[PDB]
Amino acid sequence: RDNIQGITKPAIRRLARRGGVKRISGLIYEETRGVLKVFLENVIRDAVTYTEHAKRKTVTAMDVVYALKRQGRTLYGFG
Amino acid sequence: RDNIQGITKPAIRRLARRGGVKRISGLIYEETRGVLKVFLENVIRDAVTYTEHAKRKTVTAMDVVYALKRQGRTLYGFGG
Amino acid sequence: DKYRTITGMCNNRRSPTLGASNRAFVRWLPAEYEDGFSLPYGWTPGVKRNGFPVALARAVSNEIVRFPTDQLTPDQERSLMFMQWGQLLDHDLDFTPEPA
Amino acid sequence: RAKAKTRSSRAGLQFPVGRVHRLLRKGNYAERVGAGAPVYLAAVLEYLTAEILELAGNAARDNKKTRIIPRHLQLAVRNDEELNKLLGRVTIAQGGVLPNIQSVLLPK
Amino acid sequence: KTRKESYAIYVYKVLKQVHPDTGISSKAMSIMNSFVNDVFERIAGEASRLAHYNKRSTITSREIQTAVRLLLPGELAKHAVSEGTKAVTKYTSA
Amino acid sequence: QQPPCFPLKIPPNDPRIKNQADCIPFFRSCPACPGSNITIRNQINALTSFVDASMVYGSEEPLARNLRNMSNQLGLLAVNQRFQDNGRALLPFDNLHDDPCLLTNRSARIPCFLAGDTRSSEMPELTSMHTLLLREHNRLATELKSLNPRWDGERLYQEARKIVGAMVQIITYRDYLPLVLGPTAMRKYLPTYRSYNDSVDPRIANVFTNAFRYGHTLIQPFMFRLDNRYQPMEPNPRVPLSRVFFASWRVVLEGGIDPILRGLMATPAKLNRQNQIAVDEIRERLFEQVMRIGLDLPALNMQRSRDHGLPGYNAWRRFCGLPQPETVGQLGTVLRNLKLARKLMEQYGTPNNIDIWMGGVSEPLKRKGRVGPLLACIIGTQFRKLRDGDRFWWENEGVFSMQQRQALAQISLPRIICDNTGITTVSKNNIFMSNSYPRDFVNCSTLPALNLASWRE
Amino acid sequence: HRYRPGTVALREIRRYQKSTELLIRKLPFQRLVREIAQDFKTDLRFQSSAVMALQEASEAYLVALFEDTNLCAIHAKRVTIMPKDIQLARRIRGER
């Protein structure tokens, strides 16, 4: 499953526009996809560890919140 | 009481050499002095708060170690 | 390429014959011989190696390896399955044939 | 009463299981502490200590020294990816820095 | 004089296990003591948080195992886990 | 002394061989390119340099075909047609011009067995391991046929072959290597697997064949067999190792492979100490019955190291990155022993001349490991190359499905041992570490089996 | 005799990356620390270990900052470090 290509080029352009970027080189889309994959791998690994410790099969929002918080990325709004 | 000039230009140049810097502009020294003063002010303020809570008058090494660990700058070798 | 080949052929695309069976070993260091090409050390009597005589392997085994058996010390953290699996894995990896 | 034998000897460790248990009980971590938690913690701490000490001793030997100094600990930690990730935000006193120079600055 | 506890004799025993002919200075022993204390506090704090999340009131070896999995990076963690298990089983046998 | 013979000359005052004219038999290895003089001699690897369960499936196509069962459509592997251990399969027999198995005992008249390797009958323990692997493959094929009845015999054979290869790889790289190298060397030389890498040479190095003989120092001088209660089985609970060499009749006619496996699981190995290298059973009585005179396994090791033209101890110390001693004091510092360094210097004269096996087994062992730093370096490098250069690695993407990976990761040696034969009580956790009855044994009615339900097509 | 510019600089880089000592004189740093602490509490005392720990922390911080500054300077196709590089490194690090 090659779902990393589901994060399209216009989506990355929108994320760059929100960040204040005016001109965009054509080689940053693969780089952004790699960066996003690394970040997601770290957070999801921590969340799945938290889920497995509780002997559950469902990844809850609290697991994601704890996984983010333990990386210094506290997220407000999901409990 | 202008002891911020005790951090001489050769000392800043040595610190830059240890960091791998080959050529140094002439205005780097005042900027480095300001940066060092800011860092020292933060750490010493935290250390003095820790000392005052203990109702002491000397700033021990453990107060400095705790003050550093608060900022996320753990230091090994002094204290425990 | 759904399964392995018995001979291990064409496993590497760059060099299909690399890693297969019935080929030469890889030399991590250049070989040393008493003549320089194929003569083993100790073949010709009186030939000194690096200014020193070549020891008899049986003599080395006699003086250094030999020890009275009655003070054998068993391993307190390993079983004979350790030795058996080591031997089986070795019989997997390599086998150097010699002329009959 | 039988001869007292330490818990760390039963687990075959060098780090103290009893002291670690006392520190867990007195440290305000949880209301109760299991019987096997101190053994696990002592084993993990001994493993990490042995790893870093082995690397530091190798670094000292490469320098033709006999005694480990903070420089050798810094060289051991900074030359290992996992240990460098574990101690990313840690300063070692009298450790120095890892010798590197950017390729741009070298004469061409 | 008040006794000051430290992880000095145990670090020296481990060092003699690894490098029997290598010594260690005083600054290096201070650094190793600080390292042991730091890792102990990190693992114990993570285990306490894990116990609190699941509404438990006991720190067990499963909490310590999960804390080691979360904190230690990559291969290190795996080896650490093995060592820890290797101890508890032995401790149970005796 | 004419080619291809390189006999071992007997030194004076030899405790065993008084006749100095006698020489231990020894044959040089087959050259890679015979008939040349301008090319440096190199040796031939007769087997595939991969962990592919090739001890039972053969490395040559004619032998590989001969091993399978062609008289059916179940894709099984041929077993012995005349002997069975309590109704369980045994290895198929082999025919040879000169069979040492018959020479061991004429009255019994059982020839050597046949498997993927010609050395599968040196001792009953290796034959027991081979028979266990064969039984496991046959049982896997049967359960795959019951699981998938539309499948053909060739498909069943290939699938069970893949399963057994992945099983061997998992067991080795997860249980055996950490107990050899120790945590530090295993972590240094075998880091976390990333992906296949075709720029890596998986060929077996020449030194490895001499650096993997460290196991000659773990050999106990006796063979132990235990009954169903892990008690000394009568007759002959313990047998000298000189009388079990090539004695294949001890497998068919002496209760089968269950007592041998039970003895292996519940017997401590031998600890390698700097003053206790190897026992006399393999040093003065190796292959005593088959050969005219007993062999010397350590002396054979050094002689074969010389024959292959391998460099000295210091060359490998420099190659691996360790300090290279030059004098007696430096050698004593490296070995952490003064008597042994003095003996090595009085026999060789310089550390540059010490054989790789001698230097490897004379070094102090690592922490929680069974080899010294140099042997650890060589072995870890070789196994890292084998893992990273194998395109059919069990962890490689596409070789196995995700659910198949999760099913495979739960396998274990005790499960196979108590599932493919009559033993019920087996050791727990690391089978290579548990050697005390009954403190660390289980009933294996608790540990889970291999879930093949992910193999539905 | 005279060395070309940038040669003694590289020699100094190699020299100070091998040592572990402190590169700031101890007395001026102690005076600076006391002057800074004067603004929080009056008539304060310092253990010698406290001043030594402060010096170690400050030197490590400055060396790391100069490494980041060198990276920023090289990014802009330059060899000298300017105050703008220090400001960029600090702003990206989150300090400003």
Ligand code: HEM
């Ligand atoms: C326990 C009883 C064992 C016996 C009686 C035995 C016997 C032998 C003999 C006679 C040789 C040929 C000697 C030579 O010319 O090099 C040999 C080869 C070898 N053995 Fe063993 N062995 C035993 C166990 C082991 C173990 C446990 C290992 C490894 C863990 C091992 C590894 C090797 C290797 C690497 C070779 C070289 C193969 C070659 O170069 O063709 N052996 N064995």
